[PDB]
Every structure is written in structure tokens, then in C-alpha cells.
Amino acid sequence: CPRFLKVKNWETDVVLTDTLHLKSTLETGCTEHICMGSIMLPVRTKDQLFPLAKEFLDQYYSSIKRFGSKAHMDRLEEVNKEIESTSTYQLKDTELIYGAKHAWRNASRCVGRIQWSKLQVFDARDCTTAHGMFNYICNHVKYATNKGNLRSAITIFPQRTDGKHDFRVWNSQLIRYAGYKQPDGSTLGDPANVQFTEICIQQGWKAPRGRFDVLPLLLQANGNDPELFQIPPELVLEVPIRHPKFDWFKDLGLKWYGLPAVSNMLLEIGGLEFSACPFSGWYMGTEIGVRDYCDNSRYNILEEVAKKMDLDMRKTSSLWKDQALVEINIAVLYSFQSDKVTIVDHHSATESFIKHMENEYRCRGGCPADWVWIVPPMSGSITPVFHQEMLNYRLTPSFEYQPDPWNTHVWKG
Amino acid sequence: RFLKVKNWETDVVLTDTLHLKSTLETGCTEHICMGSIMLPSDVRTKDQLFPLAKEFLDQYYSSIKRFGSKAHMDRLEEVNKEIESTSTYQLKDTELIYGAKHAWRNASRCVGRIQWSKLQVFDARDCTTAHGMFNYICNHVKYATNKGNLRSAITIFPQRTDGKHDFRVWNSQLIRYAGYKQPDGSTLGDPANVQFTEICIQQGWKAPRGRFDVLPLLLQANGNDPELFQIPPELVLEVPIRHPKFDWFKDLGLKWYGLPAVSNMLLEIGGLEFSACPFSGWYMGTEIGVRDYCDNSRYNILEEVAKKMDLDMRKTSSLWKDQALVEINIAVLYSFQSDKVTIVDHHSATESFIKHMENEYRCRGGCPADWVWIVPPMSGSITPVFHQEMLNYRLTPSFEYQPDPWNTHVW
Ligand code: HEM
Ligand code: HEM
Ligand SMILES: CNCc1cccc(-c2cncc(CCc3cc(C)cc(N)n3)c2)c1
Numbered sequence: 020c021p022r023f024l025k026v027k028n029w030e031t032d033v034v035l036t037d038t039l040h041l042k043s044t045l046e047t048g049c050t051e052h053i054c055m056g057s058i059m060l061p062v063r064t065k066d067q068l069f070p071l072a073k074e075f076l077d078q079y080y081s082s083i084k085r086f087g088s089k090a091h092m093d094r095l096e097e098v099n100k101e102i103e104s105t106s107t108y109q110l111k112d113t114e115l116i117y118g119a120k121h122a123w124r125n126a127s128r129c130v131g132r133i134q135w136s137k138l139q140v141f142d143a144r145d146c147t148t149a150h151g152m153f154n155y156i157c158n159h160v161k162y163a164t165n166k167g168n169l170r171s172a173i174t175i176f177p178q179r180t181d182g183k184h185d186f187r188v189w190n191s192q193l194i195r196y197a198g199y200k201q202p203d204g205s206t207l208g209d210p211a212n213v214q215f216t217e218i219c220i221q222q223g224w225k226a227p228r229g230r231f232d233v234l235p236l237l238l239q240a241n242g243n244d245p246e247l248f249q250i251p252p253e254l255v256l257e258v259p260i261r262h263p264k265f266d267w268f269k270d271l272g273l274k275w276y277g278l279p280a281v282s283n284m285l286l287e288i289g290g291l292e293f294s295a296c297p298f299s300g301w302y303m304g305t306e307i308g309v310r311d312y313c314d315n316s317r318y319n320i321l322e323e324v325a326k327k328m329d330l331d332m333r334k335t336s337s338l339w340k341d342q343a344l345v346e347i348n349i350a351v352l353y354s355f356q357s358d359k360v361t362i363v364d365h366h367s368a369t370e371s372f373i374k375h376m377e378n379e380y381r382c383r384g385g386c387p388a389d390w391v392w393i394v395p396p397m398s399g400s401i402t403p404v405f406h407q408e409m410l411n412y413r414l415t416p417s418f419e420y421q422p423d424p425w426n427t428h429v430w431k432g
Numbered sequence: 433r434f435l436k437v438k439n440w441e442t443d444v445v446l447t448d449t450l451h452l453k454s455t456l457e458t459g460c461t462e463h464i465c466m467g468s469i470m471l472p473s474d475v476r477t478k479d480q481l482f483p484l485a486k487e488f489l490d491q492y493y494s495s496i497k498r499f500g501s502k503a504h505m506d507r508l509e510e511v512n513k514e515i516e517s518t519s520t521y522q523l524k525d526t527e528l529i530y531g532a533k534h535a536w537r538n539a540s541r542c543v544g545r546i547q548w549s550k551l552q553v554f555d556a557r558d559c560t561t562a563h564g565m566f567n568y569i570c571n572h573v574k575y576a577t578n579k580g581n582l583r584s585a586i587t588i589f590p591q592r593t594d595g596k597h598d599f600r601v602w603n604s605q606l607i608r609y610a611g612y613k614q615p616d617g618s619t620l621g622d623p624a625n626v627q628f629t630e631i632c633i634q635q636g637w638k639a640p641r642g643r644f645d646v647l648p649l650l651l652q653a654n655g656n657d658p659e660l661f662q663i664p665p666e667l668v669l670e671v672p673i674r675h676p677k678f679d680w681f682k683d684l685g686l687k688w689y690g691l692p693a694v695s696n697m698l699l700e701i702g703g704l705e706f707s708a709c710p711f712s713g714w715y716m717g718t719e720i721g722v723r724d725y726c727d728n729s730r731y732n733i734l735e736e737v738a739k740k741m742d743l744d745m746r747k748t749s750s751l752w753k754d755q756a757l758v759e760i761n762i763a764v765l766y767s768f769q770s771d772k773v774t775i776v777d778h779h780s781a782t783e784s785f786i787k788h789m790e791n792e793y794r795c796r797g798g799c800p801a802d803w804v805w806i807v808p809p810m811s812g813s814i815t816p817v818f819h820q821e822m823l824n825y826r827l828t829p830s831f832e833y834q835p836d837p838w839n840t841h842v843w
């Protein structure tokens with residue numbers, strides 16, 4: 020724990036000094052003997068709860084310039100009594116909004132954080148049933164989509180109590196396409212969603228069995244068995260994919276949804292755990308064009324595209340894969356822009372992230388960042404983040420991973 | 433303590449036990465990960481040296497299936513006596529070769545390690561002068577180049593003694609191009625070599641002030657002041673860069689050297705330190721086409737190529753940078769292949785490394801790997817290493833960074 024750590028940008032020689040890392044609480048997974056930097060995935064008693072609450076409230080009252088005020092001390096007193104009496108406590112609306120914005124600010128794997136202070140927070144802590152969850156999520160989807168002019172948002176459902184009454188969205192993302200495993204081993208739709216699609220089918224979903232079927236919401240309230248709901252199609256904004264020069268690209272039959280919305284993570288604020296907290300922003304082009312379309316384990320279209328460009332596919336050293344990859348990503352950006360749906364290219368997004376990061380070092384004393392996730396999955400070193408040294412550490416409030424609900428849920432019947 | 437790594441493309445999970453043998457530290461802690469830091473953070477004494485020797489001799493004699501044998505114990509005793517008596521010791525040829533091959537095997541930032549056992553080791557421990565060093569290095573360069581059919585090699589000069597008599601190659605690579613300032617204010621040649629080029633000039637180099645001037649070697653023997661030598665031009669194989677479809681590409685006047693040879697690292701074996709140990713393999717295309725040619729702080733040619741292709745350079749979202757990048761890298765590979773000079777593309781190299789990883793996990797119980805360096809600087813996720821979890825840890829024998837000699841050297 021040196022008081023100071025420096026990071027260097029090897030393109031510009033800009034050096035920054037991190038002090039924020041001293042406020043780090045959680046573990047990284049690394050030790051002095053091993054680095055787990057590329058590892059994807061490396062109730063609560065009142066004893067451990069009041070320090071977490073106090074730490075959070077101190078940060079909140081500092082940020083509003085009321086540290087040590089009567090208001091601050093009264094709040095600490097109030098939360099303390101509430102914890103020792105009820106074993107938990109409730110956040111004020113202001114503290115909830117602060118908490119969610121800062122969990123985003125602290126998200127070291129997110130390149131989009133220049134936007135963190137612009138987040139619409141929907142307080143759904145009065146929700147009690149799956150039907151109510153469905154209503155709240157429809158409203159979030161409509162607000163966030165904004166007819167293509169996307170707005171960042173998060174909807175926060177009631178916190179965990181004894182761990183037996185959890186709210187969960189079983190979908191990993193609010194909008195996703197179904198995947199179907201055929202008897203011959205082939206896959207229709209999104210191969211990554213085969214298992215979840217099967218769960219949905221088992222729960223009674225009638226699958227149209229096409230290549231781009233929007234999955235139903237599977238929603239769990241208060242620890243009850245989850246229930247199926249179909250998002251109104253008119254709320255699901257989609258973009259057919261075409262290419263500005265290649266007129267055959269449309270006949271690939273590709274489209275994607277406009278709203279990226281993560282729904283399987285846990286929001287921790289002041290020791291409290293919000294197990295259902297779907298959040299959404301707008302896409303960076305490579306997410307679709309590189310990963311969704313071109314991962315071997317996803318739609319995997321590099322082959323067909325390269326064929327239609329008539330590239331030399333007999334030797335990898337022709338770089339036919341790289342050539343097709345670029346065209347596909349051009350087409351995604353082109354399509355979204357043409358239909359006036361918010362999207363950002365990986366050049367713009369990484370450039371903005373560097374400006375954000377430098378701003379954060381100056382005003383906050385640091386910006387935790389995961390290089391392995393921040394660097395885009397194509398053209399890495401012609402973006403500025405590639406050459407930027409980053410320190411990764413964990414601040415709270417935070418977004419955390421949690422087990423998949425189908426592995427832990429106790430079925431009521 | 434027994435760690436698992438998962439491939440998220442194939443769902444294959446491997447179990448690493450080799451990390452438990454890790455000696456050196458990572459830079460990371462439980463509170464902060466320094467995985468993206470390029471460089472995280474004086475003789476050895478008698479007491480420090482003998483356990484290092486034993487650890488090494490133990491793994492050597494294990495490797496030849498004679499662990500705990502008479503010859504094993506005999507060698508341990510002999511080295512022990514030699515250290516006690518002379519405060520250092522000398523490696524047997526067999527041990528030197530083993531150690532060098534395993535330093536490569538342990539290089540966590542190297543994607544090319546499937547080749548680790550096929551390394552030609554040149555023992556230059558009898559070298560005493562800078563002229564001797566020059567001769568050894570010329571022979572290395574000729575052997576490794578092999579008229580375009582490259583062969584991996586390392587040349588190992590005398591080990592550090594009291595630290596006052598270090599052998600050093602002052603160049604960071606055996607072959608690189610000069611960089612010059614401008615009254616124009618711009619930069620001619622390789623911008624990353626302006627400082628070194630000035631030192632060469634200050635030491636008396638006659639610079640032709642061109643865009644691709646092979647730098648002279650600056651060689652330091654036995655702690656003496658470094659001396660200048662020019663590598664015979666006919667030993668430095670270069671490749672003119674042309675494109676298989678774009679006839680205008682040759683007009684850029686681009687070329688690059690065929691031999692990638694690192695000369696500024698320190699080789700540690702059994703606690704002994706070899707401060708001058710140039711090694712060489714063959715290029716992966718992206719090294720030249722992505723980094724050397726398109727880094728903004730390097731030859732920075734993206735804009736020029738983009739213009740020749742007549743792409744829309746008004747908006748970043750047209751991905752004109754990305755399109756030019758691919759074409760530049762197509763040309764590099766095409767040029768090397770056409771001139772019959774060994775090169776590997778990033779798809780081929782990363783596929784090899786995945787096979788090497790699986791081999792190492794199966795027969796060794798792990799493979800230390802730095803994902804940040806192993807994933808190529810373009811088209812990351814369409815190479816298999818992107819989806820491969822890797823554990824990074826430090827085994828010896830190893831190649832280590834050391835301070836640049838011009839900051840340490842007392843003249
Ligand atoms: C507003 C525009 C945004 C952009 C352009 C953006 C960009 C990205 C991208 C490209 C990723 C990587 C996704 C992946 O590879 O699976 C990511 C990850 C992440 N983002 Fe952002 N994001 C945005 C908004 C948000 C918001 C509103 C939140 C929360 C309130 C957020 C929190 C996170 C978190 C927690 C991750 C890690 C995801 C994981 O571990 O699976 N982001 N972001
Ligand atoms: C024979 C084919 C080889 C290939 C294709 C290959 C590939 C690579 C590449 C692409 C890098 C990254 C270099 C950079 O970005 O600056 C690298 C680094 C490295 N390689 Fe290999 N290499 C080969 C041979 C060797 C040999 C023969 C040795 C040692 C005897 C070696 C040891 C290392 C080390 C220590 C690094 C890290 C160097 C640093 O930290 O700057 N490699 N290799
Ligand atoms: C570790 N990868 C998790 C994963 C795999 C496959 C697909 C996804 C995924 C599916 N649909 C939407 C997303 C959106 C991710 C995201 C979230 C947010 C808030 C913003 C943004 N630009 N991107 C991811 C995630």
C-alpha cells in the first residue's frame with residue numbers, strides 16, 4: 020500500500036499518479052505470486068453491516084459537502100438504530116441515486132464511464148410481484164430506448180433480506196435472441212442462449228424457432244418461482260443490418276436490438292445487496308460486429324461474409340478474417356446511424372474514456388480500470404487505451420457477479 | 433492453491449499446479465492488479481546464491497531423470513564448494529543449454545514458445561573484448577538468418593561477476609533503424625530511437641541521416657567503455673514492402689528487417705546473471721504492420737495509406753483506420769512470403785500457442801502467460817487466445833528487464 024502509484028501512457032509519455040487505490044476494500048484475486056488479471060470470474064450479519072453502512076454514508080455526506088454535519092451524524096444514528104433493531108436498513112432516495120451512479124463510476128470493466136453522472140434511476144423498491152417487475156421493466160425499456168435516442172437507466176428492485184426472498188431477473192440481459200440446438204447438432208439463433216431458451220420453453224414459452232426471436236422475461240419476486248412475460252414487440256427496437264457499399268449484405272438477413280441492458284448483476288450499496296437491478300446504456304459497435312456476429316461460439320458469420328467478398332480463404336495469412344471483420348463492423352455502425360439509433364464506434368469510445376480517466380485522476384485521485392476488458396476486441400493498438408497503463412482495484416458501491424438463479428433457486432412448485 | 437483456467441470459446445478447463453513453484457513476485461497484490469503495467473519493479477552474496485543454484489540443479493537433474501542420484505549429489509557438492517571458495521560458480525554446457533531453453537519456456541509474454549525446445553545456444557563465455565562480441569554477434573545473425581529460413585538462436589556472453597565488469601549490448605535489439613531530430617521540427621526514421629541514435633553519434637557514428645539506417649552495435653565488454661561496430665550490410669536481410677493488390681504501395685518506400693533479435697534483457701540461470709544475451713526468432717506479422725508501422729509514436733503511416741486508398745477520413749466511424757490497418761498487414765505478410773523470409777501471421781501463431789498451452793498443462797502442470805502481451809494488437813477476439821484465461825507468474829530460469837546501460841555506466 021504505497022501512498023502513490025504511477026501509470027504511464029506509452030504513446031504520449033503522460034504519467035498519472037493514483038491515490039484513490041488506498042480506498043480499496045474488496046480483493047482482486049491476485050497475489051504477490053500470481054496475477055489473475057485475465058480471469059473472467061475471480062446472508063450478511065449486522066456485525067459486518069454497520070461499518071459498511073458508515074463507510075458509505077461518510078462518502079455520501081462528503082460528496083455533498085456535509086461531512087460531520089448534524090444531518091450526517093443524525094443519519095448515522097438513525098441507520099445504526101435501524102440495523103440493531105431490524106438487522107438491516109433502508110436507503111434514502113438521494114443515497115440510492117448516489118449509490119447507483121457511483122457503482123457505475125467504479126465499474127472497472129466499463130469503457131463508457133464518461134457518462135456515469137448522467138444516469139436515470141428508477142426506484143422500484145415498492146415492487147412486490149413478478150407482474151409488478153414486468154411493468155417496471157417495460158417502462159425502463161421504453162424510457163431508455165426513447166425512439167432510438169438512447170438514455171442510460173437503471174431500475175432497482177427490493178434489496179436482499181434473508182437470501183430466501185430474492186428478487187431476480189433470470190435473463191442475463193433484458194433483450195436477447197433465442198438459441199435452439201437442432202438434433203443434427205447445428206444451432207438456430209444465438210448459440211450462447213440455448214440453455215436459457217430451454218428453461219423458457221420448459222416454463223411454457225411457445226418458441227417461434229427463428230434466427231432472431233426476442234426471448235421472454237423470466238422474473239422472480241420475493242423468492243417465489245419465476246414467471247414468464249413477453250416484452251411488447253412495439254417496445255423492442257431493432258436495426259436491420261446493411262452495408263454502405265455492399266448491397267448483398269442485407270440479404271444476410273441480419274438485425275440486432277438497439278438496447279444493451281445487463282440484468283444479472285448485483286448492486287452493492289453500503290452493505291445492502293440489490294440482486295435485481297437491470298441497467299442499460301447504448302452499444303459500442305464492436306460488441307455486435309465483433310463479438311455477437313463473429314465469435315465462433317455466437318452467430319459466427321465471418322465465413323459467409325468472406326465468401327461473398329470473394330476473399331482468398333485458403334490461407335489465414337491473406338487476413339481474410341480481419342478484412343471481413345472490418346466490413347461487418349462498418350455495416351453495424353452504418354445501419355444504426357442510418358436508422359438514428361444511438362451507437363458509438365470503438366475509436367470515439369476509447370478516446371472519450373482516456374479523457375474521462377485523466378479527469379478522474381485529477382479530481383478523484385484515480386480511475387480503476389481493467390485493461391483486458393477496456394481494450395476493444397478488434398484493432399486494439401490503434402486505439403489509445405491499448406497504450407495506457409491501468410490499475411485495477413475494487414471500490415464500493417459496486418456491481419458484482421452473482422450465481423445464475425437456476426443453479427441456486429429452491430423451487431416452490 | 434490448485435487453480436483452474438477456462439477457455440470461454442471452447443469451455444475447456446485446465447488445472448494449473450505449476451504456479452506453486454513460482455519464485456519471483458508479480459507486482460500485483462490482493463488489493464491491486466498491475467497486470468497492464470509494462471515494467472513493475474548490486475551483487476548476489478554467497479548465502480543468496482547457493483539456494484538458487486540448488487533449486488536449479490534440482491530441476492535440471494529431475495529433467496534428465498537422475499534426481500537424487502549420485503551424480504546429482506556430486507554436482508550439488510561441487511557447486512557448493514565452488515561458491516564457498518570463489519563466491520560464484522560456472523555452469524556446465526549441458527546446464528547452460530537447459531537453462532537458456534527454459535528461460536524461453538518460462539517467458540510469459542511470448543506467444544511463440546511452442547518452439548522453445550528448438551533453440552540454438554551459442555556459448556560465448558570465452559569472450560573478452562568488444563571485438564570478440566562483434567564477431568560472435570555477426571555469426572549469430574548469419575546463422576539465425578540462414579538466407580531467409582530463420583532459426584531461433586541465443587548467444588550468451590560472460591556472466592556478471594562483481595557488477596563492475598558487466599558485458600552489455602547497448603542496443604535494445606540487434607537490428608533497428610535510426611531516428612533523427614529536425615530543424616523542420618519533425619522526425620526522420622524511427623522516432624523511438626532518437627536518443628540511442630544521438631548516443632551513437634556522440635560516440636562517433638557517421639550517420640547517413642536516412643529513413644531506414646541500420647544502427648551500429650554499441651558493445652560493452654568486461655565493464656569497459658562501449659565500442660561502435662557496423663554489422664556487415666550483407667548480413668542484414670531486409671524486405672521491401674509491397675501489396676498483392678495495390679500497386680501504389682511500393683511507392684511508400686517501406687522496408688523492414690527480417691531478424692527480430694532482443695539484446696537488452698538479462699538471462700538468469702541458477703542465480704547467475706547473464707547481462708548480455710541477445711536472442712532471436714522470427715516475426716509475427718502484426719509486430720511490423722501494426723506496431724512498427726502504425727503506432728503514432730513510431731513510423732505512423734496510417735493517414736498516408738488511408739489517403740492512397742481514398743477512404744473517408746472525415747469520421748472515425750467509417751473505420752478508415754481499421755481498413756488501412758488490415759491492408760498494411762496484408763502487405764507485410766505478402767512481402768515476407770514472396771521474398772521467402774520466415775514470418776507467421778497472428779492467426780497461425782495464436783493457434784500454435786493454444787496447442788502449446790494444452791501441451792504444457794498436460795506435461796508440466798501449467799504455462800505462465802501474460803494475456804495483455806499474448807493477444808495480438810489487432811483482431812483480438814477472432815484469435816483463440818482472446819477467449820483463453822491465463823495465469824501469469826514468474827518461474828526461473830528467466831529473461832528479465834535491466835536498466836539501460838547509459839544510465840548506469842561510469843566512463
Ligand atoms: C451509456 C453508454 C455505455 C457504454 C458505451 C458502455 C460500454 C460498455 C462495454 C462495451 C462494455 C463491455 C460489455 C461486454 O463486453 O460484454 C461494458 C461493460 C460494463 N458496463 Fe458499461 N457502457 C455504457 C453504460 C453503462 C451503464 C449505464 C452501466 C451501469 C449503470 C454500465 C456498467 C457496466 C458494467 C458493470 C460492465 C461489466 C459487465 C460485465 O462484467 O459483464 N455501463 N460497458
Ligand atoms: C521463433 C519464433 C518466435 C515468435 C513468433 C515470437 C513471438 C513473440 C512476440 C510477438 C512477442 C511480443 C514482442 C513485442 O511485442 O515487443 C514476443 C516476446 C518475447 N519473446 Fe518471443 N518469439 C519467438 C522467439 C523467441 C525466442 C527464440 C526467445 C528467447 C530465446 C523469445 C523470448 C521472448 C521474450 C523474453 C519476450 C518478451 C520480450 C519483452 O518483454 O520485450 N522469443 N515473442
Ligand atoms: C462475458 N460476456 C457476457 C456476454 C456474452 C454475450 C452477450 C452479452 C450481451 C448481450 N446483450 C447485451 C449486452 C450488453 C453489454 C452492455 C451493457 C451496457 C450497460 C452498455 C453496453 N454498451 N453494453 C451484452 C454479454
Ligand SMILES: CNCc1cccc(-c2cncc(CCc3cc(C)cc(N)n3)c2)c1
Binds near residue numbers: 605607713715719
Ligand atoms: C515494449 N516494446 C519494446 C519495443 C518497442 C519498439 C520496438 C521493439 C522491437 C524492435 N525490433 C525488434 C523487436 C523484436 C521482438 C521479438 C523478439 C523475438 C525473439 C521474436 C519476435 N517475433 N519478436 C522488438 C520493442
Ligand SMILES: C[C@H](O)[C@H](O)[C@H]1CNc2nc(N)[nH]c(=O)c2N1
Binds near residue numbers: 407468470804805806
Ligand atoms: C500499457 C500496455 O501494457 C502496453 O501498451 C502493452 C500492451 N500489450 C503489449 N503486447 C505486446 N505484445 N507488446 C507490447 O509492447 C504491448 N504493450
Ligand SMILES: C[C@H](O)[C@H](O)[C@H]1CNc2nc(N)[nH]c(=O)c2N1
Binds near residue numbers: 392822
Ligand atoms: C479470458 C478473457 O478474460 C475473456 O475472453 C475476456 C477478454 N476481454 C473481454 N472484454 C470485454 N469487453 N468483454 C469480454 O467478454 C471479454 N472477455
Ligand SMILES: [Zn+2]
Binds near residue numbers: 049055056
Ligand atoms: Zn494482477
